[PDB]
Every structure is written in C-alpha cells, then in structure tokens.
Amino acid sequence: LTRFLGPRYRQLARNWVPTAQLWGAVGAVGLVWATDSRLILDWVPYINGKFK
Amino acid sequence: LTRFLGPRYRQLARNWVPTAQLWGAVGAVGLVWATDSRLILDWVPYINGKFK
Amino acid sequence: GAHLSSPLASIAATNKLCQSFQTFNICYADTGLLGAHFVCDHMSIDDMMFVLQGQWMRLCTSATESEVLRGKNLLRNALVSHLDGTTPVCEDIGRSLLTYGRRIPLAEWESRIAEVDARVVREVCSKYFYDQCPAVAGFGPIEQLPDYNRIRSGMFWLRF
Amino acid sequence: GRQFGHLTRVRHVITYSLSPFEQRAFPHYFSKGIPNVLRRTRACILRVAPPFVAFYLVYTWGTQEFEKSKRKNPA
Amino acid sequence: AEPEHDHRKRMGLKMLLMMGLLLPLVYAMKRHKWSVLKSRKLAYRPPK
Amino acid sequence: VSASSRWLEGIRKWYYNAAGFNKLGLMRDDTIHENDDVKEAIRRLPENLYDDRVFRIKRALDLSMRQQILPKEQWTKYEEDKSYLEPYLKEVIRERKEREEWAKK
Amino acid sequence: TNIRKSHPLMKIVNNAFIDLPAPSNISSWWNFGSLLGICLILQILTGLFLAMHYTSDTTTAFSSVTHICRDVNYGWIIRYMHANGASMFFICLYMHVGRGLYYGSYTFLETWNIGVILLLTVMATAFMGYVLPWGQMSFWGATVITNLLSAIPYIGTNLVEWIWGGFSVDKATLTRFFAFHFILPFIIMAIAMVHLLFLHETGSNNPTGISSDVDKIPFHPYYTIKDILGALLLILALMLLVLFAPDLLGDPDNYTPANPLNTPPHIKPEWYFLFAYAILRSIPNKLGGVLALAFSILILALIPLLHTSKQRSMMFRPLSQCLFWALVADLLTLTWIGGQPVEHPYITIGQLASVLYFLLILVLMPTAGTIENKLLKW
Amino acid sequence: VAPTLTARLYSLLFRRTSTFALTIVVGALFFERAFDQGADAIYEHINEGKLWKHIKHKYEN
Ligand code: HEM
Ligand code: HEM
Ligand SMILES: CO/C=C(/C(=O)OC)c1ccccc1Oc1cc(Oc2ccccc2C#N)ncn1
C-alpha cells in the first residue's frame, strides 16, 4: 500500500497512461461493435444504416 | 516367446499354480454370488431357499 | 555392477540405490535377528526398502532351484573360507561347544546344506519372513524412511 | 508438490513406535476417553455456546412475539 | 402417495443393522492402523 | 511501574493463558504464520534455536493429533516465554523497508 | 522399481492419494474435502439413472418424476438419494468453508478462490436442478429468483428475457435448465481437479496453523482409512434421510404440478439457500437486494485480504473464536428467518442478522485479530 | 480351542491373500442368506398380521 507511493511509481504510471488509455478505447469500441450498441452507433457516418 | 522356455520358468509356473487356481475359485464364487446364478446355486444347502 | 546374480545387488548398483547392504542372521539362545542393513542417500530409502522387501517375498512365495544352488554354493565357500587357520577354528571350537554342545563337523554342515532345495527355502522363509512384524532401526537423514505400517504391508503380497 | 526427503531439516529427534499387531486399538477407551472429552468441552464452552444461547433467546422471543401480534383484545 | 413405504422401512432396518455392525468395525480398522502414531513416543536429544 | 500497567500485564497474562499454546508446550514465536519475512527469520536462526523450535513444533503437532495437552507444570509460563524470533524478524523487516524506500526514488 | 512412481497415470494417483505427505494432526474437519468428492460422484451416478427416465418438457416433466418413483425398478431409491445427496453436498460445503475460515486455510489464495468458484457452481447447479420436477415450488422458486436480474440498470430486462427464452419461466426454461444441470457437474469436477492441483502445491494446513513439515505422514494408510470411516458416516446420514425421512428437508408444494396463475402461501427454498433468501427480503431495494445477494457469497473472496492476525489458525485465538461462532449462529438466525414469513418481528431481526453478517466479516473479525496481536505484544 | 479360534483361522485361511479373498467371498454368500431372511423375520414381528404375507389365506382362489 504505502510501498508503491514514490517518484518512480508516478513516473511508471505516467509511462503506461497513454497505453492504458488506448486499451480502454479497444475495450469500448470492441464492446460497442460486438453488441451493436445503437446509442453510440447512431453517431458514426457509414455504420448509421439501420433505418427503422 | 522362446526366451520364457526353460527349467526355471517351469519351476516358476509350478510355484504360482496353487495361487492361480485359488484366484479362479475367488473369481467363480464371486461371479456366482454377484449374479445369483441359479444353475450353480441350486446345489448349495443353505443358499437353496428360493422355492418357485 | 549390473551383472551381479542377486536381484537386490544388481538393481542397487544399476540405479545407484545405496552405498552398501548386507544380510544377517544374528543368533542367540532360542531367538535372534534376521534381515538386512543398508546405508544410502536420503532420497533412496524408499526404493531400497521396496527392493529388499520384494526380495524376501519373491523368495517366500516363488524361490527357484538354480538360485538356491548358488546360495548353497556361496555358503559352502563361506564356511570353508572362514575356517582358515588356527584363530578361526579355535573360535569355532569354543563357540560351538557353548551353543551346540558339540563341534558340528564340516561333512554334517555340507549334509545339512545339500538338503536345502527351493521348496525348503520358501517354506523356511515363510515361517520367519512372511506376514510378520519387523523390528526397524533407523539413523541419519531418515525423512524418506517408510512409515511402519507401510513396512508391515511390504511383509506380505496381495498377489499370493 | 513435495515428497518425503525434500520437506525440511530435522535434527536429534528419536521416535519410538510399536507394531499395530503388538498393541491394542482401544487402550483405555472410556477410562482415559471420558475425562478427555469433558476436558475439551470445558476448554471451549465459553467460545462455542454463548452465540447459540443468544440465538436460542432471539429465536424463542421472536416466535412468541410473532404469535401475539395479530390478536387484539379491544376492537 | 408413498407405495414404497413398506419396502423403505424394511431396507431401513437392514441399513441400521448393517451400520451397527460396520461402524464399530471400520472404526477398529482405523484405530488399528492409527495406533502406530497414537502410542508413538518422542525424545529430543540435542548435542552436549 | 504502575497499578493499571500491572493490570494491562495481568490481562495480557490472562489472554496468553486463554490462547493456550503454552498448554501444548509452545512458545509464542512458534505459533507465528510463516510469511516471507518470517521464513527468512527462521532461516537466520542459530542451530540450537532452530533445533529446539523444530522439537517444540513436533511435540505440539503430536499432542494436537492425539487431542491431548501437556501436564500443568510443563506449560510455557508467560513470564519465561522467550521471544527468540523478535530481533531476527525485526531485522528482516528493517531490510525489506530499506529496499522498498530505495525502489521508490 | 516401484511402478507407482514411474508409470505416468499411477504417478498422479501415488502423488495425490498414496505417498502424499499429509499433516499428522488434521481434524475430522479435513474429511469434508473427500466427502464433497463422494457427493459429486454420488450426484453424477444418481443423476444419470434419473436422466435415463426423466422427460425435459412441461407436459410430463412432473409425470416422469412420478414414473421414476412409482414404476421404475427401485426408482424411488435413486430419486430420494439424489434429492438428499444435494443436501448432503450442502452440509459438507458449509463445514468445509467454515473449517477453511476457522483454521486460516484461505491464505492458500488460489486453492480457496477456486473453491469460491466451486461453491457458486454447485449453488447454480442445485438451483437449476430444483426446477426440473416442475412442482409448485420448482416454478415459483424460479420466477421469484430470475426476476431479480430485472433490477440491473439498462442491461436488466434484456438479460432475464434471454435466460427465460420468452417473457416468463416457461417451456424453454425447463428444457435449458436441464441442459445446464447436466453439463455443470462435469465442469465442477474439472474445477475440483484444478482445486486439488493448487492444494498439492503447499499440501494441507492443520488445526494449529503451524507448519507440519516436521511431522508429515503418508496419505496411505492413515488418511485412506480415515476417509473410508468418514464416507461410512456420510452414507449413514444420507441413508437415514432417504430411508426414514425422505420428505423432511423438502417442501410439500413440489408434490402438486406447476401453476403460473396460482402463487403458493409460502415461497421457501430448501435449507441451504434460506440464509441468503433472508438477506434478500431484508433489504427493501430491488437492485440493493441482488447486490447484497451476490456479496453474500462473493465476500469469501475478500476474507484473505481481511486477515490481520500474526497467527494462521483460530486455535490460539479466543476473541476470534467467539466472533466465529457468532457468524455460525448468525447464519443459523438467517436460516430460521429465511423459512419464516415477512411479518412484524421477522423483518427487523432478519435485517439485523443481515447487517451483522457483513459487519462480522468486513469489520468485526479483522478488528479482533488486531487486538489479539496487541495482547501478545505483536 | 488349544491354539485359539483366531490362531487356527489365521493359519488356515488368513495367511494367503488368496484364501483370505476366498473366505470373504464364501463368507459373503452365507452372510447374505442369514442376514436378508433374518432381518425379514425381524420385520415380520414388528408388523404382525399387517402384511399381505399374513393376510394371503383370506383370498384364496
Ligand atoms: C466442489 C466442492 C469442493 C470439493 C470437491 C473440494 C475438494 C477439496 C479437497 C479434496 C480438499 C483437501 C482435503 C481437505 O482439506 O478437506 C480441499 C481443501 C480445501 N478446499 Fe476444497 N473443495 C470444495 C469446496 C471448497 C470451497 C467452497 C472452498 C472455499 C470457498 C474450498 C477451499 C478449500 C481450501 C482452502 C482447502 C484447504 C484446506 C486445508 O487443507 O487447510 N473448497 N478441498
Ligand atoms: C453438482 C451435482 C448435482 C447437484 C447438486 C444436483 C442437484 C439436484 C437437485 C437439487 C434436484 C432436485 C431434487 C428433487 O426435487 O428431487 C435434482 C434433480 C435432478 N437432477 Fe441433479 N444434481 C447434480 C447432478 C446431476 C447430474 C450430473 C445429472 C445428469 C446426469 C442430474 C440430473 C437430474 C435430474 C434429471 C433431476 C430431475 C429428477 C428429480 O427431480 O429427481 N443431476 N438435482
Ligand atoms: C428454482 O428455485 C430453486 C430453489 C432452491 O433450489 O432452493 C434451495 C428455490 C426455492 C424457493 C425459493 C427460492 C429458490 O431459489 C433461491 C436461489 C438462491 O440463489 C442464491 C443462493 C446463494 C447466494 C446467492 C443466491 C442468489 N441470487 N437463493 C435463495 N433461493
């Protein structure tokens, strides 16, 4: 708990932050595409084709 | 095949013959009791009680 | 090494199962200790017990004519090689007079040796070895030394 | 997984054991046994029983209060 | 509702009479094997 | 030194007796859970202490199995419960904490 | 050479059941591990002989079960053996978990965590198994529990209707619950194998929580014969139920066919779900219900992170011993409340026991362990 | 009785695992007859007259 609190760890977090952000994008777009989540997919231009 | 043919092996067979005979008796009486094989069990005095 | 007649000795050399073993028949008035002693690595105690116990049992149930003649021959040689010179013979005179009452002549020992066929070995072995409680003495790195119950279990064969 | 001969370092400990065929299975079954069970009941009744006795009271009261709640003497 | 009634009471008696013979017997088997440990004696002999 | 500090000491002697490892001949440090700092402290013990430790654990496991306890006189007295692992375990944690302070900068 | 060691198959059997170094001092509380294995096998062997005669359709779902008990040669013996075996399995699961908690066995992180997965899987099995007879309790238990999944935000209603195969517990629900009830015990056995794989890594813990390396005995014959005697005791308890009291632990409504239009006076689980059923009705919120219900079992996964004591076992821990027995009594309180209606004294003391369960695991027992350390100057 | 009943039982039938198995198998057959019927006879006494085997002579042809 207290052992992971220091300058190196703040650097280590800063180093892996763009990566952990991009995996979130992979997870989200991945979930959105796999379920056909209409709420989000109504916004994207070519995927829009599902006229009720 | 030809390697197991000799005086020692004849002795070794003679040594295990009463044992292999008695395991046959265990197997037979075991099978007879477990199936209730009437053909054999009609001969034994106390077990005889199954009057049609 | 691997070419030794004795199965225990041959397996022990091949698989480096010990530094040594020896059989014994320690005699006292109306009683005695009969079995084996061995010295081995910490990891080799289990195999050594198994291979020895299995040998007692092989002999108890399924001893063979040829190996029994070898045992007879080793004994004839052991008895004659032992009685070599004044100190061994004088020792044999003193001891035998206390334990047997007479000196048993070598011809009689031979006569009693010659009598022992395979049927004798497995009957006599069974009388003493088969399904009996051993006395077990262990010293040194003995974590791998079998539990008494397991040693006791090796004193009989389920196959026989 | 570990096997015998690789477990741990132990030094200078002698264990004397007897063959099961030389000794009786139930040495002093009731003479030594009965005192022992009473001893380890006594050693634990203050840790095991007071939550159950507490449940028993919360059970006995609760059941009583459930029955005498629907009925009423005045209108 | 329960045709098996008579049969289950019958085998139930056989269950109890068997267990009454088997329970002490398996106990005695376990107690026999375990007597090697139950009567075992320890001695600690550290150097001088 | 104090009347109430003698009472904390008597409540501690009470708990010690209630814990009852002394009934199995054990010392307090025998009963510790074996973590990495602990494993190292056992490893760092001298021959005589390790051998005694082994025997005390051996004895208590034997008693545990046969569901017995030691005679009253042979119980480890609270006053003479030698905390043999203390300085070893304190040194191992000291060393760990340094490594962890170093792994921070 | 000894073929027990060399041979690839026998090697496993030797390392698992024969030559395995086991602690000299393990209680009768260590017996339930083997007893659970007996119970899983017993359930597979009785379950299969039932499946040889059972029909998976709402029409003769109830009639096939009747056909088993009435017409099928000794079918009644197999049927009550299976129904009581499921309860036997649950008495054992509980002793086993309790033993793990008392003796600190949870510090085996993976073994324990695989056991949490093992508990959930046996629970999921029994729940689905109960629907199969298609009695009043079978249907009404199913509708009252599945409908909880509606309370999940956004995903909710879609999930229930996906598990349902329609808009209620219907034709399709009975059929799929049989399929899932048939496959799950095998997936259990495979997880139980991985459970044992992780256990053999450390070997067994013991009543003292101190290492037993200095006093290890071979599994055979000591724990072979002790597990035989233990199994003879489990067969006694199982056959006492099957052959003297086959309807004792069961609900009478299951003896009338399912009726979706008529709800029974009482809606109660078999004893093994009563504690958790109580927790659910105790909290008035829909979602809070299911979230406390999942947390009712999922909490066991937190227990290792809430270990605070310098010692492993509770053997030398009196403060923790009292708070342990408080948990067992509190669960027995929740068991009692589960099988009771939702009226006056029961609503209050029900939710009182519910808040206590979570306080006892999350706050109370981790505090006692800290105090016990201070008392030993540790 | 000169050597014990147990001593003569070990010598003749318990030494060999073969005859040990044979004595168990032969002993299992003879036990099943004495038990099944013996326990059935005990079941007769606690249900005297209640059973169809007692009633039987009432409805004959
Ligand atoms: C599918 C039912 C289960 C089976 C078949 C099973 C199997 C067993 C077996 C054979 C053992 C070794 C003997 C013993 O110590 O009892 C054991 C120990 C263990 N099991 Fe399970 N178990 C199951 C349920 C559980 C559950 C539900 C948990 C935890 C929520 C659990 C966690 C453990 C732990 C921690 C041990 C180690 C106990 C120790 O040796 O100190 N198991 N299991
Ligand atoms: C994880 C082990 C198992 C558990 C805990 C379990 C649990 C249950 C339960 C609680 C019941 C309802 C009891 C009743 O009302 O009679 C049931 C019935 C049923 N089970 Fe299982 N069972 C298991 C193994 C299996 C297996 C492996 C099969 C498939 C071979 C199976 C097939 C059946 C069938 C067909 C029924 C309906 C017949 C009946 O109710 O008696 N069971 N089971
Ligand atoms: C189909 O109903 C099966 C039941 C059953 O098998 O009870 C033992 C049952 C019968 C009546 C009422 C409800 C029933 O189902 C259940 C199911 C249940 O599931 C869990 C068990 C333990 C922990 C959490 C949950 C959940 N969710 N908790 C309580 N009752």
PDB file of N, CA and C and ligand atoms in Angstrom, chain G residues 26 29-38 40 89 93 96-97 99-100 103-108 111-120 122 188 192 195-196 199-200 203-206 219 227 300 312, ligand 1:
ATOM      1  N   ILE G  26      -4.464 -33.560  11.441  1.00  0.00           N
ATOM      2  CA  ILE G  26      -5.677 -32.990  10.838  1.00  0.00           C
ATOM      3  C   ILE G  26      -6.965 -33.595  11.345  1.00  0.00           C
ATOM      4  N   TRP G  29     -12.569 -32.386  10.552  1.00  0.00           N
ATOM      5  CA  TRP G  29     -12.922 -31.236   9.729  1.00  0.00           C
ATOM      6  C   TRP G  29     -12.183 -31.217   8.390  1.00  0.00           C
ATOM      7  N   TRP G  30     -11.157 -32.063   8.247  1.00  0.00           N
ATOM      8  CA  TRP G  30     -10.453 -32.211   6.975  1.00  0.00           C
ATOM      9  C   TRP G  30     -11.085 -33.294   6.099  1.00  0.00           C
ATOM     10  N   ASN G  31     -12.067 -34.014   6.664  1.00  0.00           N
ATOM     11  CA  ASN G  31     -12.741 -35.113   5.969  1.00  0.00           C
ATOM     12  C   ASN G  31     -13.695 -34.685   4.866  1.00  0.00           C
ATOM     13  N   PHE G  32     -14.289 -33.498   5.031  1.00  0.00           N
ATOM     14  CA  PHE G  32     -15.292 -32.963   4.093  1.00  0.00           C
ATOM     15  C   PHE G  32     -14.802 -32.733   2.657  1.00  0.00           C
ATOM     16  N   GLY G  33     -13.488 -32.558   2.482  1.00  0.00           N
ATOM     17  CA  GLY G  33     -12.886 -32.437   1.165  1.00  0.00           C
ATOM     18  C   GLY G  33     -13.065 -33.683   0.322  1.00  0.00           C
ATOM     19  N   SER G  34     -12.844 -34.845   0.950  1.00  0.00           N
ATOM     20  CA  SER G  34     -13.062 -36.141   0.312  1.00  0.00           C
ATOM     21  C   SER G  34     -14.565 -36.426   0.175  1.00  0.00           C
ATOM     22  N   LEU G  35     -15.323 -36.030   1.205  1.00  0.00           N
ATOM     23  CA  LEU G  35     -16.779 -36.209   1.246  1.00  0.00           C
ATOM     24  C   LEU G  35     -17.506 -35.435   0.176  1.00  0.00           C
ATOM     25  N   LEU G  36     -16.982 -34.253  -0.166  1.00  0.00           N
ATOM     26  CA  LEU G  36     -17.505 -33.460  -1.281  1.00  0.00           C
ATOM     27  C   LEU G  36     -17.310 -34.200  -2.632  1.00  0.00           C
ATOM     28  N   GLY G  37     -16.135 -34.837  -2.792  1.00  0.00           N
ATOM     29  CA  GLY G  37     -15.828 -35.674  -3.939  1.00  0.00           C
ATOM     30  C   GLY G  37     -16.740 -36.885  -4.044  1.00  0.00           C
ATOM     31  N   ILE G  38     -17.031 -37.521  -2.901  1.00  0.00           N
ATOM     32  CA  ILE G  38     -18.013 -38.621  -2.831  1.00  0.00           C
ATOM     33  C   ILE G  38     -19.402 -38.094  -3.270  1.00  0.00           C
ATOM     34  N   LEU G  40     -20.134 -35.399  -5.100  1.00  0.00           N
ATOM     35  CA  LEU G  40     -20.142 -35.068  -6.533  1.00  0.00           C
ATOM     36  C   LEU G  40     -20.287 -36.305  -7.412  1.00  0.00           C
ATOM     37  N   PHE G  89     -24.351 -32.755   0.098  1.00  0.00           N
ATOM     38  CA  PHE G  89     -23.374 -31.897  -0.601  1.00  0.00           C
ATOM     39  C   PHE G  89     -23.307 -30.501   0.034  1.00  0.00           C
ATOM     40  N   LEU G  93     -20.298 -28.668   2.076  1.00  0.00           N
ATOM     41  CA  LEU G  93     -19.760 -27.402   1.554  1.00  0.00           C
ATOM     42  C   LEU G  93     -19.588 -26.383   2.654  1.00  0.00           C
ATOM     43  N   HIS G  96     -16.825 -27.458   5.327  1.00  0.00           N
ATOM     44  CA  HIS G  96     -15.595 -27.256   4.576  1.00  0.00           C
ATOM     45  C   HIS G  96     -15.182 -25.785   4.539  1.00  0.00           C
ATOM     46  N   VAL G  97     -16.116 -24.901   4.150  1.00  0.00           N
ATOM     47  CA  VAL G  97     -15.856 -23.447   4.102  1.00  0.00           C
ATOM     48  C   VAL G  97     -15.553 -22.903   5.517  1.00  0.00           C
ATOM     49  N   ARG G  99     -14.503 -24.570   8.201  1.00  0.00           N
ATOM     50  CA  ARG G  99     -13.175 -25.104   8.539  1.00  0.00           C
ATOM     51  C   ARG G  99     -12.076 -24.222   7.933  1.00  0.00           C
ATOM     52  N   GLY G 100     -12.247 -23.851   6.660  1.00  0.00           N
ATOM     53  CA  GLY G 100     -11.297 -23.001   5.955  1.00  0.00           C
ATOM     54  C   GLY G 100     -11.140 -21.638   6.588  1.00  0.00           C
ATOM     55  N   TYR G 103      -9.621 -22.138  10.463  1.00  0.00           N
ATOM     56  CA  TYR G 103      -8.241 -22.579  10.508  1.00  0.00           C
ATOM     57  C   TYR G 103      -7.273 -21.765   9.653  1.00  0.00           C
ATOM     58  N   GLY G 104      -7.787 -20.714   9.012  1.00  0.00           N
ATOM     59  CA  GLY G 104      -6.972 -19.813   8.208  1.00  0.00           C
ATOM     60  C   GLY G 104      -6.509 -20.372   6.878  1.00  0.00           C
ATOM     61  N   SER G 105      -7.157 -21.464   6.434  1.00  0.00           N
ATOM     62  CA  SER G 105      -6.826 -22.180   5.186  1.00  0.00           C
ATOM     63  C   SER G 105      -6.949 -21.334   3.928  1.00  0.00           C
ATOM     64  N   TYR G 106      -7.654 -20.202   4.038  1.00  0.00           N
ATOM     65  CA  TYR G 106      -7.857 -19.246   2.945  1.00  0.00           C
ATOM     66  C   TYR G 106      -6.592 -18.566   2.451  1.00  0.00           C
ATOM     67  N   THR G 107      -5.535 -18.580   3.270  1.00  0.00           N
ATOM     68  CA  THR G 107      -4.229 -17.980   2.905  1.00  0.00           C
ATOM     69  C   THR G 107      -3.577 -18.690   1.695  1.00  0.00           C
ATOM     70  N   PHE G 108      -4.047 -19.922   1.414  1.00  0.00           N
ATOM     71  CA  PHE G 108      -3.851 -20.607   0.129  1.00  0.00           C
ATOM     72  C   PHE G 108      -4.754 -19.898  -0.892  1.00  0.00           C
ATOM     73  N   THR G 111      -6.154 -21.945  -4.279  1.00  0.00           N
ATOM     74  CA  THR G 111      -6.958 -23.093  -3.792  1.00  0.00           C
ATOM     75  C   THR G 111      -8.370 -22.630  -3.333  1.00  0.00           C
ATOM     76  N   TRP G 112      -8.375 -21.683  -2.377  1.00  0.00           N
ATOM     77  CA  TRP G 112      -9.570 -21.050  -1.804  1.00  0.00           C
ATOM     78  C   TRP G 112     -10.442 -20.339  -2.853  1.00  0.00           C
ATOM     79  N   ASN G 113      -9.811 -19.519  -3.701  1.00  0.00           N
ATOM     80  CA  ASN G 113     -10.509 -18.770  -4.745  1.00  0.00           C
ATOM     81  C   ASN G 113     -11.151 -19.669  -5.790  1.00  0.00           C
ATOM     82  N   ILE G 114     -10.495 -20.799  -6.083  1.00  0.00           N
ATOM     83  CA  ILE G 114     -11.069 -21.845  -6.925  1.00  0.00           C
ATOM     84  C   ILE G 114     -12.242 -22.517  -6.182  1.00  0.00           C
ATOM     85  N   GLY G 115     -12.146 -22.591  -4.853  1.00  0.00           N
ATOM     86  CA  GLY G 115     -13.228 -23.104  -4.019  1.00  0.00           C
ATOM     87  C   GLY G 115     -14.466 -22.211  -3.979  1.00  0.00           C
ATOM     88  N   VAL G 116     -14.253 -20.892  -4.011  1.00  0.00           N
ATOM     89  CA  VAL G 116     -15.337 -19.891  -4.125  1.00  0.00           C
ATOM     90  C   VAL G 116     -16.076 -20.105  -5.461  1.00  0.00           C
ATOM     91  N   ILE G 117     -15.305 -20.266  -6.549  1.00  0.00           N
ATOM     92  CA  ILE G 117     -15.864 -20.588  -7.858  1.00  0.00           C
ATOM     93  C   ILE G 117     -16.605 -21.934  -7.779  1.00  0.00           C
ATOM     94  N   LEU G 118     -16.023 -22.911  -7.055  1.00  0.00           N
ATOM     95  CA  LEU G 118     -16.648 -24.231  -6.821  1.00  0.00           C
ATOM     96  C   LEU G 118     -17.971 -24.168  -6.067  1.00  0.00           C
ATOM     97  N   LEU G 119     -18.056 -23.300  -5.050  1.00  0.00           N
ATOM     98  CA  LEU G 119     -19.305 -23.100  -4.289  1.00  0.00           C
ATOM     99  C   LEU G 119     -20.429 -22.525  -5.165  1.00  0.00           C
ATOM    100  N   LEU G 120     -20.121 -21.436  -5.896  1.00  0.00           N
ATOM    101  CA  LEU G 120     -21.065 -20.779  -6.827  1.00  0.00           C
ATOM    102  C   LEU G 120     -21.622 -21.754  -7.870  1.00  0.00           C
ATOM    103  N   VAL G 122     -21.793 -25.164  -7.654  1.00  0.00           N
ATOM    104  CA  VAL G 122     -22.679 -26.174  -7.022  1.00  0.00           C
ATOM    105  C   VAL G 122     -24.039 -25.551  -6.673  1.00  0.00           C
ATOM    106  N   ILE G 188     -17.782 -28.754 -12.852  1.00  0.00           N
ATOM    107  CA  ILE G 188     -17.435 -28.752 -11.424  1.00  0.00           C
ATOM    108  C   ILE G 188     -16.245 -29.685 -11.167  1.00  0.00           C
ATOM    109  N   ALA G 192     -12.729 -28.922  -9.625  1.00  0.00           N
ATOM    110  CA  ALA G 192     -12.319 -29.671  -8.423  1.00  0.00           C
ATOM    111  C   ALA G 192     -10.943 -30.356  -8.581  1.00  0.00           C
ATOM    112  N   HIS G 195      -8.545 -27.462  -8.384  1.00  0.00           N
ATOM    113  CA  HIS G 195      -8.592 -27.152  -6.947  1.00  0.00           C
ATOM    114  C   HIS G 195      -7.515 -27.963  -6.197  1.00  0.00           C
ATOM    115  N   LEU G 196      -7.507 -29.283  -6.443  1.00  0.00           N
ATOM    116  CA  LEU G 196      -6.557 -30.212  -5.832  1.00  0.00           C
ATOM    117  C   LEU G 196      -5.123 -30.009  -6.317  1.00  0.00           C
ATOM    118  N   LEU G 199      -3.882 -27.295  -4.301  1.00  0.00           N
ATOM    119  CA  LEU G 199      -3.696 -27.734  -2.897  1.00  0.00           C
ATOM    120  C   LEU G 199      -2.377 -28.496  -2.682  1.00  0.00           C
ATOM    121  N   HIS G 200      -2.058 -29.401  -3.614  1.00  0.00           N
ATOM    122  CA  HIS G 200      -0.846 -30.244  -3.537  1.00  0.00           C
ATOM    123  C   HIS G 200       0.465 -29.471  -3.594  1.00  0.00           C
ATOM    124  N   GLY G 203       0.467 -28.534   0.076  1.00  0.00           N
ATOM    125  CA  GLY G 203      -0.012 -29.573   0.956  1.00  0.00           C
ATOM    126  C   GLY G 203      -1.101 -28.985   1.838  1.00  0.00           C
ATOM    127  N   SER G 204      -1.612 -29.811   2.745  1.00  0.00           N
ATOM    128  CA  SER G 204      -2.689 -29.412   3.619  1.00  0.00           C
ATOM    129  C   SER G 204      -2.191 -28.545   4.769  1.00  0.00           C
ATOM    130  N   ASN G 205      -3.056 -27.630   5.220  1.00  0.00           N
ATOM    131  CA  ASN G 205      -2.890 -26.911   6.505  1.00  0.00           C
ATOM    132  C   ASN G 205      -3.389 -27.862   7.627  1.00  0.00           C
ATOM    133  N   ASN G 206      -3.247 -27.450   8.899  1.00  0.00           N
ATOM    134  CA  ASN G 206      -3.629 -28.265  10.074  1.00  0.00           C
ATOM    135  C   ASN G 206      -4.236 -27.413  11.226  1.00  0.00           C
ATOM    136  N   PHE G 219      -0.304 -40.253   3.123  1.00  0.00           N
ATOM    137  CA  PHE G 219      -1.760 -40.309   2.997  1.00  0.00           C
ATOM    138  C   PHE G 219      -2.303 -41.735   3.174  1.00  0.00           C
ATOM    139  N   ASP G 227     -10.707 -41.641   5.669  1.00  0.00           N
ATOM    140  CA  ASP G 227     -11.685 -41.199   4.664  1.00  0.00           C
ATOM    141  C   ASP G 227     -12.748 -42.262   4.369  1.00  0.00           C
ATOM    142  N   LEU G 300     -16.411 -14.103   0.490  1.00  0.00           N
ATOM    143  CA  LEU G 300     -15.379 -15.099   0.820  1.00  0.00           C
ATOM    144  C   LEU G 300     -14.062 -14.850   0.098  1.00  0.00           C
ATOM    145  N   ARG G 312      -1.978 -18.029  12.032  1.00  0.00           N
ATOM    146  CA  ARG G 312      -2.847 -18.530  10.953  1.00  0.00           C
ATOM    147  C   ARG G 312      -4.214 -18.965  11.492  1.00  0.00           C
TER     148      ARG G 312
HETATM  149  C1  HEM I   1     -16.910 -28.708  -5.220  1.00  0.00           C
HETATM  150  C2  HEM I   1     -16.812 -28.948  -3.696  1.00  0.00           C
HETATM  151  C3  HEM I   1     -15.367 -28.995  -3.229  1.00  0.00           C
HETATM  152  C4  HEM I   1     -14.556 -30.077  -3.314  1.00  0.00           C
HETATM  153  C5  HEM I   1     -14.822 -31.362  -4.061  1.00  0.00           C
HETATM  154  C6  HEM I   1     -13.341 -29.748  -2.619  1.00  0.00           C
HETATM  155  C7  HEM I   1     -12.247 -30.590  -2.556  1.00  0.00           C
HETATM  156  C8  HEM I   1     -11.371 -30.390  -1.508  1.00  0.00           C
HETATM  157  C9  HEM I   1     -10.393 -31.379  -1.071  1.00  0.00           C
HETATM  158  C10 HEM I   1     -10.322 -32.817  -1.506  1.00  0.00           C
HETATM  159  C11 HEM I   1      -9.575 -30.787  -0.154  1.00  0.00           C
HETATM  160  C12 HEM I   1      -8.452 -31.490   0.619  1.00  0.00           C
HETATM  161  C13 HEM I   1      -8.977 -32.152   1.928  1.00  0.00           C
HETATM  162  C14 HEM I   1      -9.386 -31.170   2.863  1.00  0.00           C
HETATM  163  O1  HEM I   1      -8.560 -30.385   3.393  1.00  0.00           O
HETATM  164  O2  HEM I   1     -10.600 -31.018   3.088  1.00  0.00           O
HETATM  165  C15 HEM I   1      -9.949 -29.392  -0.049  1.00  0.00           C
HETATM  166  C16 HEM I   1      -9.307 -28.464   0.767  1.00  0.00           C
HETATM  167  C17 HEM I   1      -9.537 -27.109   0.597  1.00  0.00           C
HETATM  168  N1  HEM I   1     -10.583 -26.538  -0.076  1.00  0.00           N
HETATM  169 FE1  HEM I   1     -11.996 -27.515  -1.102  1.00  0.00          FE
HETATM  170  N2  HEM I   1     -13.456 -28.496  -2.052  1.00  0.00           N
HETATM  171  C18 HEM I   1     -14.649 -27.960  -2.464  1.00  0.00           C
HETATM  172  C19 HEM I   1     -15.239 -26.811  -1.951  1.00  0.00           C
HETATM  173  C20 HEM I   1     -14.425 -25.782  -1.454  1.00  0.00           C
HETATM  174  C21 HEM I   1     -14.892 -24.424  -1.235  1.00  0.00           C
HETATM  175  C22 HEM I   1     -16.316 -23.999  -1.453  1.00  0.00           C
HETATM  176  C23 HEM I   1     -13.831 -23.686  -0.762  1.00  0.00           C
HETATM  177  C24 HEM I   1     -13.695 -22.196  -0.412  1.00  0.00           C
HETATM  178  C25 HEM I   1     -14.900 -21.255  -0.652  1.00  0.00           C
HETATM  179  C26 HEM I   1     -12.706 -24.618  -0.664  1.00  0.00           C
HETATM  180  C27 HEM I   1     -11.360 -24.194  -0.372  1.00  0.00           C
HETATM  181  C28 HEM I   1     -10.507 -25.172   0.111  1.00  0.00           C
HETATM  182  C29 HEM I   1      -9.342 -24.890   0.900  1.00  0.00           C
HETATM  183  C30 HEM I   1      -8.866 -23.516   1.323  1.00  0.00           C
HETATM  184  C31 HEM I   1      -8.788 -26.085   1.225  1.00  0.00           C
HETATM  185  C32 HEM I   1      -7.507 -26.246   2.048  1.00  0.00           C
HETATM  186  C33 HEM I   1      -7.833 -26.807   3.444  1.00  0.00           C
HETATM  187  C34 HEM I   1      -6.659 -27.175   4.108  1.00  0.00           C
HETATM  188  O3  HEM I   1      -6.028 -28.223   3.790  1.00  0.00           O
HETATM  189  O4  HEM I   1      -6.292 -26.485   5.072  1.00  0.00           O
HETATM  190  N3  HEM I   1     -13.071 -25.833  -1.201  1.00  0.00           N
HETATM  191  N4  HEM I   1     -10.940 -29.218  -0.975  1.00  0.00           N
END
